[PDB]
Design a binder for these strands. Structure first.
Ligand code: MG
Lengths: 302, 84, 95, 1338
DNA sequence: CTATGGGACGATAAAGGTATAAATTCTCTATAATGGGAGCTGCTCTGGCCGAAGCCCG
RNA sequence: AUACCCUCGA
DNA sequence: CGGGCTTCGGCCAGAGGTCGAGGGTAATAAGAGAATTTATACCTTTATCGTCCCATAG
């Protein structure tokens, strides 16, 4: 029944082990795989690709900088060529909106190697999750309406309604099923139908259906989860490094655990900004960020 | 300012057998204690039921056999060396 | 006679150097309680110390030459109330 | 106004209600601009404005809008005092458990979940999961799961099993308690199990659940999801000079908590891995725990210092442990101190006061008088005059001092006498002049002592000083009616020297017409101060009440006695002053004068006595010189003889004949006898060392040697110290306690050698080291005594009960320790008092016994009387004014509102610093009487008494018992009840040396089962020392002889079976191991013949043990129920002695382990009150078996023995008062209206039973058993929580009050002290009564 | 012939714009660096609290 | 004008 | 022969006089430089409130 928190931190963290630099390369490869998957998913959203074209237009019009948009691949002239190719792919896909699905798959293939600055990443994420939030809010609105007013059963709810959410087929089918609940639904036809009109407007903005958007966002979520798992493995690997470096500043007017936690935050920041093509050991780059975090934490307490 | 000289327990080994109420019995030949100039302090306690327990300065009572074995003495060599 | 008090508990400080007053600790309070003297004890633990609105009013009364001793409530009890509240356990009164 | 302060758990909603903002930033003040920052620990948005009636920007500076908050300045403009009431809150990312409800010894959060504190700690420290909402699954809600276990459970189930970790899991558990269902289930399961431990645990569970249900408290509130922050001035940063800032521990802890909370939110918002998240949650839990308390689990530390940080728990605990230094101590104004100085020109009511101290203390009074007289117009002019010390300011200072008493107290005030009011007189100097006669009460000598002076201000305060605590009012000690303002050393010496007698002196013989002529002759030098003369006097006697008879009489006395009688007031005879006037005689004279003449004449008499004592100790140039220590001449001879004896004994030991162990005792006894003989010779020489000539032939007289006077007068010194000064110092003790084999032969006049000095250093070092620990223990004991007996104040006048304690003179041993007069003086009679012949009422009813009544009782032969005691007086919440008898500080009965409990505690604890066999031989001749004896006559009339309860008394001729002795079992006594036995006779010829077994029946016994080798052994000693058989030990016997026990079957001389009365079974007592049965089996044994014979601290710790009602290591085993005792089966290892009472058989009897020797003999009356095995009694068994009055007598006698050993006299009223306070609680057996077993105040149970009698049913009344609690336990178990919280264990009592939702109605002394209200006792009683009138009656 | 409501008047303070320098927090650096250390040992008792080990026992 | 440490007096 | 059931032994908490008085000691190192917000500073626009001329009701 050890009461020392440092002791149990050592116990819980001590289960994981280090790994040689090829292991770090593999973990960075996993991170790259996840971000490539989520970016390829983003490619299947026309609004996001139009937005990246707009950011490039700012680049050309000097409204954005090279270091504020792109982050290399697996000079702006290669960027010129790649975005001209991606725009031609976009136009040829839009022209024949069957073969359009193959055109978007090629579009995802072409946009797949590209890498961008994290701010645009969060912007793309915000857009896709806002579309998801709108769809989910429409779901909740219709659900609360029908369940709490017409007493319409949850079984037929979760059987017949889902995955369409946009056409009058489900309303008419429930009406033809002829329960008293469908009779009470007739008072709520107007609001549900006008909300589904807004959903249809949102779909026509994105040119895609509910099932398609669900597939893309699910794939993006899987990629984000893969990247998160890779980062978790890497930080659990470098916990030993962070405790070893945190020894330096014990009697600096701050607790040991606060120091190691700040160093942990620094090392997660380092993982967020680490690449394997640098051909370097992790510890060299992690030391700088951990020192920055710990030193800033102690300086803030002066 | 003046540094007043300090008198303290001398480093070495000390044996205590003072009558105590801990055992609530007749008597108990109490622990044998080792005190260094600098380092950890080892105590050789004596359990009420005729057993010897050893604890470091900052630990709980442990049987002396554990320390004897950790020092490298065999579980039978130590018995022959001490009990007979 | 009167002077600066401690900032946390409004009581006179201690020791010739900070002016300061002697303390009617537990034993002297018991001694006053063994006597029937409750008004001097209450004035002693209420007016001579630990009451902001009591000290000034008592000074006024002494200067005008009347001894009324409006009681008030000691500030140390308020400090205790706020500390117990900061310990996350409620305190109130029944009015 | 307000009352009934509540305590409860803090709700998150009410925590929000308390706060005025959300503290979010760790830092406090910007280094560049020195104003508090937004959302910081000092932010103006939350806590208030830095400057009174100001804002952050200065947009509004006017003093008009005191509540409006500006637009740009959201910090509302208000008074600067508001920074003390305003608190904030911190929103925690995750809930954290409260440290107090976790780490208290009974863990409230653990008890509420029926899970051990270890498991909860495992969950909190993120070591194991816990299960919430088990649903339809194998897992249970109380089940804990490890990482692998939880992973397997999740894989197997997949859902329908909510498992969490951390304080979030505990919070999710707490709010799903459903206290109603749990209470119902636990109440249903409470009586199903008959296990005492399990029933106790479930009873505690029920208590907690009902407390939560009734108190409006919610279990989820234990884990706080939001915590407050102290207002900034209560956790201030006091800037160090030089621009540094001193940060309080509270600020550091708050900053740590804020930092960890901010880290938590910003690491969860980015989805950090689970391990680091849980580590951060653990850190936040630890930081909040360290903020709330420290050292319980983690013992958090500060930066660059090994001193731990001070949390809120240590802050509310106060300095000096739990004794609140701010709410009880509370340094005061109008005070000062200085070294004290004896003033011999002071009257008893006044004290000297230095000009500067008086001028500083009374400064506002001087200002007021200056303004009233118009001598000063502005206060600046008044300050200028008072600082210039202009000659006219001394006049106004004299006017303000004339009738304004001041308070003087010593540093340790052990009793109320340690602070008394004096009417100051201006003196020239810097020291406070004290009256010499008040030094004894203050316990203050002039070797460097200091005294604090306080100036009462209100007219109430001045009148209380003059009427209750003026020095003249308190002459008699509150501990005992004996005076305390009595002549001390020097004045006693003067009075003793004045009233001596010389065999031949100048002026002896002639007769004087008046005391005036005696003074005229002495001052003219024609007569010695002590010369046997004749003088006629005019004494006024007060023999008849209201009639003062004056008579003129010629008395043979000395000049000094006649001179001193001129001081004596006009109500006492001259015979009271005709003796040598020793210290005890003078104290008794003052006591008699107080009770005869009055108080004002008594203080005048005391002042006159002090004046004459000083004057005539100055006139007598008494002095100490090297020739005063008279060494006896026979000391050398005695020392040489003892040295020869010890040399002979040492030679004998060298020969080997004498053992070292016996030689040690022999030589110590020899040296002690030699020391006693030397001391006796020295005292006999010194006392009579005066040869004088009386007109020719030489004669002897009492010595005039100065040291002998200093001893005999009692002024200063004792015989034990002259034993060292003029005789051999005697044996001295080694540090181990063993007396050193060689003594110190030399005295202090001769001077000691180096070795003897080293031994005396052993002794003196031991004593001096013991002194400090004695003082500390006495202080702690008196603090506990005061805190346990403070609510007890006289409230009623006559409660009406007629129960009390039978008080008889204490005759333990051959001498009367305390006469009946001293025990019942100042008490009140409980029932009728009768003559030796009944039907004649002597003392009718509750008449307060006074000096006249005690003299009347002495004139008659009253021996045993019953008096009303504070252990009686069953009144509620107080004590009646009768059962507490005469006040001791005053001559009359106590008055309503006297805090006799605090006086009792002070009286007991003040003198703590002074602390650290065969036959009966009648002392004097008296008619012998028997008490509590149950024995039949022997064949020849020996009257052997086998009953253990029994005593022998020798009643005097009048009828009172002059001496009593304890008669043991099997005592042969020449019974002569009514026949006087001469002194020194041996009436009882007991000689146990063994445990004899009497044979109440007769006839030819049948020793059945006596096996020679298995049950008995016919072992005969050398030289035919015994023709008997030794019983074989049960283990030393064979395998079959172990279970066989000898039995002397009861048969008559012809073979007829006989049995003892009451029980059908014969009195066939078994013969156990180590027995002595000399009578042959089958031989007629007489009635009472011995059948079986089986051979067999002090000071402050002892009184503390008695007041705590502790249990020693080996308590005395006592009988449970009276009846027929049996034999204990030793084979099982614990003796089981079943009791079979004749009135009704109760087979229940415990088993006593044979580890301690048991002296119980089977086949006799159990006598529940009696003792089974020796040892110190356990106060409890006495209480629950003998009763309450028996426990009262035992405890009172036990404490009084310890106090009388050092000769300090304390009235028993105080010990009985503390006893009443300890016996204030009773436990219930069969409730019918309450819980089965509960510790409830006897007042509560009595009220409930009285209401139930006139209520629903008649059987609703409850039966309960009285229980005794120690002072440190009785004080903490009071109904009020504020009283207990400021005594000890503040955390435990505060958590208990929080969970129980206690309410404290301020109805005690400490409650009103801490809350600043008038004391419910003394003069505040009227205010409290009026408040009750206005509150209870609408 | 006079006091008072009504309406005209106008000097300025607040409101919003609206940039603009201060200032104050935020983000990076790429050999490698991958379980800490002071922690007392010389109280003393009492008291309570769990937890284990005998002890009846039917 | 806050906490420890040291020393000293009763 | 398992099982309540009493008892005992190890472990932790709490508490240890008061009031002085004096003295002393109290806690450190990334630069660059980019970026974002905020207090400042000048200026115009609208309302507000101090202000007085004027017709009129008695
Ligand atoms: Mg002294």
């Amino acid at each position: 029944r050890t009461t020392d928190p440092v002791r149990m931190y050592m116990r819980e963290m001590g289960t994981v082990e280090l790994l040689t630099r090829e292991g770090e390369i593999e973990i960075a490869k996993r991170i790259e795989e996840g971000i490539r998957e989520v970016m390829s998913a983003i490619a299947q959203f026309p609004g996001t690709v139009d937005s990246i074209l707009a950011d490039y237009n700012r680049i050309v019009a000097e409204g954005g900088r090279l270091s504020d948009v792109l982050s290399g691949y697996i000079d702006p002239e290669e960027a010129r060529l790649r975005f001209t190719a991606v725009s031609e792919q976009l136009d040829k896909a839009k022209k024949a909106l069957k073969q359009a699905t193959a055109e978007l798959t090629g579009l995802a293939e072409l946009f797949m190697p590209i890498k961008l600055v994290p701010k645009q990443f969060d912007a793309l994420v915000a857009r896709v999750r806002s579309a998801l939030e709108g769809v989910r809010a429409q779901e909740r609105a219709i659900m609360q309406l029908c369940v709490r007013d017409a007493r319409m059963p949850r079984a037929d709810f979760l059987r017949l309604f889902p995955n369409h959410e946009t056409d009058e087929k489900w309303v008419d089918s429930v009406l033809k099923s002829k329960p008293k609940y469908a009779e009470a639904i007739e008072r709520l036809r107007d609001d549900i139908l006008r909300n589904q009109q807004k959903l249809a407007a949102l779909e026509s903005e994105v040119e895609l259906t509910v099932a398609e958007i669900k597939e893309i966002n699910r794939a993006m979520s899987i990629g984000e989860a893969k990247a998160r798992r890779a980062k978790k493995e890497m930080v659990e690997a470098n916990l030993r490094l962070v405790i070893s470096i945190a020894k330096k500043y014990t009697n600096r007017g701050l607790q040991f655990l606060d120091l190691i936690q700040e160093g942990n935050i620094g090392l997660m920041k380092a993982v967020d900004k680490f690449e394997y093509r640098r051909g370097y050991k992790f510890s060299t780059y992690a030391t700088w960020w951990i020192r920055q975090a710990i030193t800033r934490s102690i300086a803030d307490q002066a | 300012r003046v540094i007043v000289s300090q008198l303290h327990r001398s480093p070495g080994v000390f044996f205590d057998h003072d009558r105590g109420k801990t055992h609530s019995s007749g008597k108990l030949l109490y622990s044998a204690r080792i005190i260094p100039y600098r380092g950890s302090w080892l105590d050789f306690e004596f359990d009420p039921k005729d057993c010897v327990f050893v604890r470091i300065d900052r630990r709980r009572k442990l049987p002396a056999s554990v320390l004897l074995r950790a020092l490298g003495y065999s579980t039978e060599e130590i018995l022959n060396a001490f009990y007979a | 006679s009167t002077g600066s008090y401690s900032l946390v508990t409004q009581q006179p400080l201690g020791g010739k150097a900070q002016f300061g007053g002697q303390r009617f600790g537990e034993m002297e309070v018991w001694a006053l309680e063994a006597y029937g003297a409750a008004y001097t004890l209450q004035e002693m633990l209420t007016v001579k110390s630990d009451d902001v609105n009591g000290r000034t009013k008592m000074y006024k009364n002494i200067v005008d030459g009347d001894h009324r001793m409006e009681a008030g409530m000691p500030e140390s009890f308020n400090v205790l109330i706020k500390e117990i509240r900061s310990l996350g356990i409620d305190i109130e009164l029944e009015t | 106004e307000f009352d009934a302060i509540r305590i409860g758990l803090a709700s998150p909603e009410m925590i929000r209600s308390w706060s005025f903002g959300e503290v979010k930033k760790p830092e406090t003040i910007n280094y560049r601009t020195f104003k508090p920052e937004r959302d910081g620990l000092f932010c103006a948005k939350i806590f208030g404005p830095v400057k009174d009636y100001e804002c952050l920007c200065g947009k509004y500076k006017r003093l008009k809008h005191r509540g409006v908050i500006c637009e740009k300045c959201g910090v509302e403009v208000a008074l600067a005092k508001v920074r003390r009431e305003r608190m904030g809150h911190i929103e925690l990312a995750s809930p954290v458990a409260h440290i107090w409800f976790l780490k208290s010894l009974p863990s409230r959060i653990g008890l509420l979940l029926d899970m051990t504190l270890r498991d909860i700690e495992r969950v909190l420290y993120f070591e194991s999961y816990v299960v919430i909402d088990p649903g339809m699954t194998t897992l249970e809600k109380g089940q804990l799961l490890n990482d692998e276990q939880y992973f397997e459970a999740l894989e197997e189930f997949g859902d329908d099993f909510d498992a969490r970790m951390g304080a979030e899991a505990v919070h999710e558990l707490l709010n799903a308690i459903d206290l109603e269902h749990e209470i119902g289930r636990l109440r249903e399961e409470i009586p199903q199990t008959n296990s005492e431990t399990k029933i106790k645990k479930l009873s505690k569970r029920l208590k907690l659940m009902e407390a939560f249900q009734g108190s409006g408290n919610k279990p989820e509130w234990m884990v706080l999801t939001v915590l407050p922050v102290l207002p900034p001035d209560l956790r201030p940063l006091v800037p160090l000079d030089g621009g540094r800032f001193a940060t309080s521990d509270l600020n550091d802890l708050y900053r740590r908590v804020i930092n960890r909370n901010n880290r938590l939110k910003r690491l969860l918002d980015l989805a950090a891995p689970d391990i680091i998240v849980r580590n951060e949650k653990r850190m936040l839990q630890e930081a909040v725990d360290a903020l709330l308390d420290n050292g319980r689990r983690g013992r958090a530390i500060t930066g660059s210092n090994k001193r731990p940080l001070k949390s809120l728990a240590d802050m509310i605990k106060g300095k000096q442990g739990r004794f609140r230094q701010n709410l009880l101590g509370k340094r005061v104004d109008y005070s000062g101190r200085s070294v004290i100085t004896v003033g011999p020109t002071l009257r008893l009511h006044q004290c000297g006061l230095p000009k500067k101290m008086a001028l500083e203390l009374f400064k506002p009074f001087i200002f007021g008088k200056l303004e009233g007289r118009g001598m000063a117009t502005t206060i600046k002019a008044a300050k200028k005059m008072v600082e210039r010390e202009l000659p006219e300011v001394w006049d106004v200072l004299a006017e303000v001092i004339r009738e304004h008493p001041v308070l003087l107290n010593r540093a340790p005030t052990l009793h109320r006498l340690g602070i008394q009011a004096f009417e100051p007189v201006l003196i020239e100097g810097k020291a406070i002049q004290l009256h010499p006669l008040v030094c004894a009460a203050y316990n203050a000598d002039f070797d460097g002592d200091q005294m604090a002076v306080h100036v009462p201000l209100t007219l109430e305060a001045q009148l209380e000083a003059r009427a209750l605590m003026m020095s003249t009012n308190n002459i008699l000690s509150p501990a005992n009616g004996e005076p305390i303002i009595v002549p001390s050393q020097d004045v006693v010496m003067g009075l003793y020297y004045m009233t001596r007698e010389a065999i031949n002196a100048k002026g002896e013989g002639m007769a004087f017409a008046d005391l005036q002529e005696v003074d005229r002759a002495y001052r003219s030098g024609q007569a010695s101060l002590h010369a046997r003369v004749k003088v006629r006097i005019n004494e006024k006697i007060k023999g008849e009440d209201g009639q003062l008879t004056a008579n003129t009489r010629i008395v043979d006395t000395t000049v000094g006695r006649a001179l001193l009688f001129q001081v004596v007031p006009a109500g006492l005879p001259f015979d009271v002053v005709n003796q040598s006037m020793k210290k005890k005689a003078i104290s008794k004279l003052i006591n008699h004068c107080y009770r005869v003449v009055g108080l004002k004449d008594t203080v005048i008499f005391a002042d006159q006595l002090m004046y004459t004592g000083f004057a005539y100790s100055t006139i007598s140039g008494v002095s100490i010189g090297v020739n005063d220590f008279v060494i006896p001449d026979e000391k050398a001879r005695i020392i040489n003889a003892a040295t020869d004896e010890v040399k002979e004994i040492e030679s004998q030991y060298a020969s080997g004949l004498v053992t070292q162990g016996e030689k040690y005792n022999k030589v110590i006894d020899l040296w002690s006898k030699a020391n006693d003989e030397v001391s006796k010779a020295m005292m006999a020489n010194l006392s009579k060392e005066k040869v004088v000539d009386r007109e020719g032939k030489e004669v002897d007289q009492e010595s005039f040697n100065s040291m002998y006077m200093m001893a005999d007068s009692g002024a200063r010194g004792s015989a034990a110290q002259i034993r060292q000064l003029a005789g051999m110092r005697g044996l001295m003790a080694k540090p181990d306690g063993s007396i050193i084999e060689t003594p110190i032969t030399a005295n202090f006049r001769e001077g000691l050698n180096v070795l003897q000095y080293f031994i005396s250093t052993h002794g003196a070092r031991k004593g001096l080291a013991d002194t400090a620990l004695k003082t500390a223990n006495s202080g702690y004991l008196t603090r506990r005594l005061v805190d346990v007996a403070q609510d007890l104040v006289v409230t009623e006048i006559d409660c009406g009960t007629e129960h009390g304690l039978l008080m008889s003179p204490h005759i333990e041993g051959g001498d009367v320790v305390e006469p009946l007069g001293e025990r019942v003086l100042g008490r009140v009679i409980a029932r009728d008092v009768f003559k030796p012949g009944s039907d004649e009422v002597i003392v009718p009813a509750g008449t307060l016994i006074d000096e006249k009544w005690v003299d009347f009782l002495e004139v008659m032969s009253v021996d045993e009387v019953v008096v009303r005691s504070p252990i009686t007086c069953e009144t509620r919440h107080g004590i009646c004014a009768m059962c507490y008898g005469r006040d001791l500080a005053r001559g009359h009965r106590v008055n309503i509102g006297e805090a006799v409990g605090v006086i009792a505690a002070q009286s007991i604890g003040e003198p703590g610093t002074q602390l650290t066999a065969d036959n009966v031989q009648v002392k004097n001749g008296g008619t012998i009487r028997l008490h509590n004896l149950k024995h039949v006559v022997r064949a020849d009339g020996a009257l052997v008494a086998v009953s253990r309860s029994g005593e022998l008394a020798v009643a005097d001729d009048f009828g009172r018992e002059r001496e009593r002795y304890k008669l043991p079992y099997g005592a042969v006594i020449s019974v002569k009840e009514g026949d006087k036995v001469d002194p020194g006779a041996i009436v009882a010829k007991w000689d146990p040396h063994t445990h004899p077994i009497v044979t109440e029946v007769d006839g030819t016994v049948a020793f059945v089962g006596m096996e020679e080798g298995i049950t008995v052994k016919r072992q005969t000693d050398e030289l035919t020392g015994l023709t008997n058989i030794e019983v074989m030990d049960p283990k030393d016997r064979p395998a079959a002889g172990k279970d066989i026990r000898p039995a002397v079957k009861l048969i008559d001389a012809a073979g007829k079976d006989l049995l003892l009365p009451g029980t059908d079974v014969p009195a066939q007592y078994f013969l156990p191991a180590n027995a002595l049965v000399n009578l042959t089996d089958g031989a007629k044994v007489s009635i009472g013949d011995v059948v079986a014979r089986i051979p067999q601290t002090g000071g402050l710790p002892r009184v503390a043990d008695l007041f705590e009602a502790r249990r020693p290591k080996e308590p005395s085993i006592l009988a449970e129920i009276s009846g027929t005792i049996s034999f204990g089966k030793e084979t099982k290892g614990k003796r089981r002695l079943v009791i079979t009472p004749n009135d009704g058989s109760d087979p229940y009897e415990e088993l006593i382990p044979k580890w301690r020797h048991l002296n119980v003999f089977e086949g006799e009356q159990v006598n529940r009150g009696e003792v089974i095995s020796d040892g110190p009694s356990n106060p409890h068994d006495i209480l629950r078996l003998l009763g309450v009055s028996s426990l009262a007598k035992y405890i009172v006698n036990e404490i009084q023995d310890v106090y009388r050993l050092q000769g300090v006299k304390i009235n028993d009223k105080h010990i009985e008062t503390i006893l009443r306070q300890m016996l204030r609680k009773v436990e219930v057996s069969e409730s019918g209206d309450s819980s089965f077993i509960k510790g409830d105040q006897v007042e509560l149970t009595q009220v409930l039973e009285e209401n139930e009698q006139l209520g629903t049913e008649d059987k609703f009344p409850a039966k309960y058993e009285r229980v005794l609690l120690g002072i440190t336990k009785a004080s903490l178990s009071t109904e009020s929580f504020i009283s207990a919280a400021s005594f000890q264990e503040t955390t435990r009592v505060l958590t208990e009050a929080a969970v129980t939702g206690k309410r404290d109605f301020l109805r005690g002394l400490k409650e009103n002290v801490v809350v600043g209200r008038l004391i419910p006792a003394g003069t505040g009683l009227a205010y409290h009564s009026e408040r009750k009138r206005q509150r209870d009656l609408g």
